[PDB]
Amino acid sequence: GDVTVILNNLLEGYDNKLRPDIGVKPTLIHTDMYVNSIGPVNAINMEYTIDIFFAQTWYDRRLKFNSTIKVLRLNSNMVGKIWIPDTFFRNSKKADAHWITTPNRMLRIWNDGRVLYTLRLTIDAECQLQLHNFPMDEHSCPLEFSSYGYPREEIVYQWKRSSVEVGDTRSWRLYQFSFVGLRNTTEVVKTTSGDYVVMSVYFDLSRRMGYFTIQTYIPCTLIVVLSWVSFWINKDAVPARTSLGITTVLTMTTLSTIARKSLPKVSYVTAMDLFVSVCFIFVFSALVEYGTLHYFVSSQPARAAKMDSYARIFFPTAFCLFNLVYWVSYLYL
Amino acid sequence: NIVMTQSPKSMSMSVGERVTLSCKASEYVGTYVSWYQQKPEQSPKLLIYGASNRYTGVPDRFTGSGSATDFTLTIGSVQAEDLADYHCGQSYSYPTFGAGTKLELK
Amino acid sequence: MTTINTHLRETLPKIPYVKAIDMYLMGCFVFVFMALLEYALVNYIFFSQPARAAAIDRWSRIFFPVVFSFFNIVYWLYYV
Amino acid sequence: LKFGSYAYTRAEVVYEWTREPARSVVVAEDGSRLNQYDLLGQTVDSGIVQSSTGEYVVMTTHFHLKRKIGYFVIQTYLPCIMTVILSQVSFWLNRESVPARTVFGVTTVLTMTTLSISARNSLPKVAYATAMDWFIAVCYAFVFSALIEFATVNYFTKSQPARAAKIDRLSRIAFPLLFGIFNLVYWATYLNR
Amino acid sequence: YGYTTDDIEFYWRGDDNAVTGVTKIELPQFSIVDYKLITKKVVFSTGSYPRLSLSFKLKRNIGYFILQTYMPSILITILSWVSFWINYDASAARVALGITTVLT
């Protein structure tokens, strides 16, 4: 009817290559979000997936009409005919919009030129996780976006008061972590092209313990007590105790290999490989202890007999001590 | 065949007090339960299409409450012209109505 | 045996029924387990009467290959 | 499976099923690429979600599934149960053969460890304990208890052989009945649901 | 691709500040020692074309390898050596130890 006339009058003499107020003042863009789900935080690639509803609203004095209708509600068929800011996410490894069934976009042009442009995005953002204190580690890693070609003198972004609003936080694929909060931030960065206004949203993730507790800690402590079980078998049965030691060492090295294969290749010492190394040391020390015991039985049975009962008390106490220290320290750190 | 057990069969209540009616479905009916008000010598009139959505022209004292099987029709300040039958009927499958509740004044 | 059955079952999807190769591996595992439990039987009754032990060993030597060949033949005739 | 409109609120575009809502979502007879699960039935529903932009109509469709337990039985529960049996075999061996019982115990503990690891790999990296996890934990406890019992027997051997023979003859009956009772309880309380 | 060296000329802008952001790159396994910027010409059957080259020199870290596969080798060889303290009368213990170490 008459909405066709309005849309035709708005696009007569319109150049979608020139930002609104190209030579007057910067274009103020208000950005809002709606986090559907924060995807899996895989530490191997130092990335995490997020799915949002990115909304941008700005003023365009050229899309200003005067009729009884207050707002024009349009689908994605008129997005490619007006000016649209070139917002890109600076720390996204790979991100893409949605196209099924129709491009997921929305365009609402109000009466005074105010434009609202909303689209659906799935961003595989990047964040370099400091994998110390693993798996007792907490991260807070961002999602940054800015204009690509327009410097600070042309496009200025600005958060709204109630900009970022998370969803239910229950049907998210955050397995090992747990959402605790967020905060928005605005800064200005320097590039070879110019000065850009970079906005950021920090998501706070806390690694919940569990999978690792039952995947590596319990197996290794149970292997350690298995190695302690050798201290009660009589000292005359050599092959039994040697088999104990060597098979325990084999399982210990297999479990250490698996545990380190869990997280990526890092050249520093984490808190999990330290634990498996201490357990390895314990098992190796029990085996060399039995070796010296058997060697001393031929020399002085006195020391070979006293050593067994000494170790029976010295090993579990030293392991309790190690555990206590380790756990308390890391839980406070 | 989905059967709708509507309760109670007939209640008598005075003017101005809150009243509630229940309609329990046998199988699953998501929110496709409708409430009709049939006055004597008249045709049923749709009150609540879907669960908890008043029809155009229905006073705000009628409210629906939906679930998978149990549904409720609550009337607030009950007036003097609300003395009629109240049928509940699902539509998730081929429509089957309830027995209805004869509301009375005393 | 158990590690061959698990590694082989890692190359296929999580199929809920018993394939033919699974049946063969489970028969081979039963034969191995029975051999171990026959050594344990011998070890148990050894001190009380070694004659029955040497006898059981002869009977085992004679009748593990026979039963295994019979199972193998019925298997390769039921599936082929 | 929730689908709605983009850019069109409820005052503009309302969705509705074309047939009776129970007969709208149809599934083909031969259309089942499910090898692990078992599709039971569909269930549709229509609601309205509020938002920051407007009120939208949202159509929902749940496909009810039911996991098939055959593969997990074959590859976790049988190896666990067999390892436990192989562990309890160590009680019928004589007390003079120490290396044999030591090998039994150690190898059964190693087998249970590797079984736990291989059983936890199939699932997502979830932070709570599943039913299979409880079963594997109980089997681990049984094998470890068998090893501890053998160690106690060996400790009392050559000093109080009567007590050693007593606890061995008692553990030849206490472990299998306890494992059977645990199996009955576990399977009964987990198959009724 | 299309234009030979008498149609186009490539050069770095600044010749040492043309490439930035290298010192901030953190790699989990390697370490950027340095980088060079080269400007040359290649000759194909169709003409002589301009070319630039950005050549990093990654040096691999060694800590992870020590902790992952050098230490276990040394400990397995030492576990093999312990078999020398066992007396030669026990033939089921030294065979066990040595054989297991070989397999490992």
Ligand SMILES: *[C@@H]1O[C@H](CO)[C@@H](O[C@@H]2O[C@H](CO)[C@@H](O[C@@H]3O[C@H](CO[C@H]4O[C@H](CO[C@H]5O[C@H](CO)[C@@H](O)[C@H](O)[C@@H]5O[C@H]5O[C@H](CO)[C@@H](O)[C@H](O)[C@@H]5O)[C@@H](O)[C@H](O[C@H]5O[C@H](CO)[C@@H](O)[C@H](O)[C@@H]5O)[C@@H]4O)[C@@H](O)[C@H](O[C@H]4O[C@H](CO)[C@@H](O)[C@H](O)[C@@H]4O[C@H]4O[C@H](CO)[C@@H](O)[C@H](O)[C@@H]4O[C@H]4O[C@H](CO)[C@@H](O)[C@H](O)[C@@H]4O)[C@@H]3O)[C@H](O)[C@H]2NC(C)=O)[C@H](O)[C@H]1NC(C)=O
């Ligand atoms: C190296 O070579 C590569 C291969 O050649 C090349 O990649 C190609 O790049 C081009 C350009 O970048 C891509 O073409 C664009 O694609 C945009 C969207 O792309 C998404 O979808 C395509 C598939 O496209 C189908 O689906 C969309 C969504 O439904 C449709 O809109 C398309 O028309 C098309 O539909 C046909 O095909 C469907 C089957 O898929 C059918 O169902 C359908 O019926 C049609 O037959 C995907 O392939 C894309 O994925 C790839 O790209 C992403 C990019 O991020 C990658 O991440 C990803 O990994 C993949 O690689 C992606 O998912 C189109 O929107 C776009 O068309 C619009 O823009 C142009 C330019 O502005 C306009 O001229 C054009 O008219 C369109 O604008 C109209 O429509 C929009 C809708 O949003 C309106 O807003 C707009 O106002 C305008 O409306 C006006 O015109 C309409 C008619 O057009 C009219 O109806 C309106 O009323 C109004 O008047 C363009 O097609 C191409 O897909 C890439 N191909 C591949 C294989 O990657 C690469 O860039 C090269 N590299 C370099 C360095 O050069």
Ligand SMILES: CCCCCCCCCCCCCCCCCCCC(=O)O[C@H](COC(=O)CCCCCCCCCCCCCC)COP(=O)(O)OCCN
């Ligand atoms: C040492 C490592 C050894 C590794 C290798 C060992 C392999 C063993 C080989 C020996 C022979 C074993 C015989 C097993 C026969 C085949 C098994 C097929 C299982 C199967 O597919 O059945 C599922 C049923 O599960 C169920 O319903 C299961 C319910 C209960 C499970 C069994 C409980 C055992 C308890 C035993 C107690 C003994 C303790 C006392 C000492 C299918 O089910 P579906 O869902 O796919 O379709 C059907 C609806 N059900």
Ligand SMILES: CCCCCCCCCCCCCCCCCCCC(=O)O[C@H](COC(=O)CCCCCCCCCCCCCC)COP(=O)(O)OCCN
């Ligand atoms: C429905 C069942 C539900 C149960 C679920 C979980 C149960 C798991 C463990 C149960 C195993 C069965 C235990 C049956 C043993 C009974 C026979 C014992 C004979 C006996 O009395 O002698 C004792 C022998 O020690 C022994 O028998 C050694 C016992 C070892 C202690 C337990 C070790 C647990 C392992 C923990 C680590 C693994 C955790 C896994 C993550 C020492 O008694 P005495 O010196 O007084 O002799 C004088 C007594 N006439």
Ligand SMILES: *[C@@H]1O[C@H](CO)[C@@H](O[C@@H]2O[C@H](CO)[C@@H](O)[C@H](O)[C@H]2NC(C)=O)[C@H](O)[C@H]1NC(C)=O
């Ligand atoms: C998102 O950004 C806005 C704008 O920077 C923050 O809003 C400010 O909040 C502080 C404290 O709550 C107030 O003192 C300011 O007046 C607010 N400014 C505006 C323009 O509203 C908001 O706190 C940020 N959200 C976070 C950090 O979660």
Ligand SMILES: CC(=O)[C@H]1CC[C@H]2[C@@H]3CC=C4C[C@@H](OS(=O)(=O)O)CC[C@]4(C)[C@H]3CC[C@]12C
């Ligand atoms: C104590 C004894 O009297 C001897 C007699 C039989 C021996 C075992 C024969 C084979 C193997 C498998 C080998 O596999 S491995 O992958 O774990 O390295 C590890 C070592 C192990 C368990 C021997 C340990 C020592 C014995 C138990």
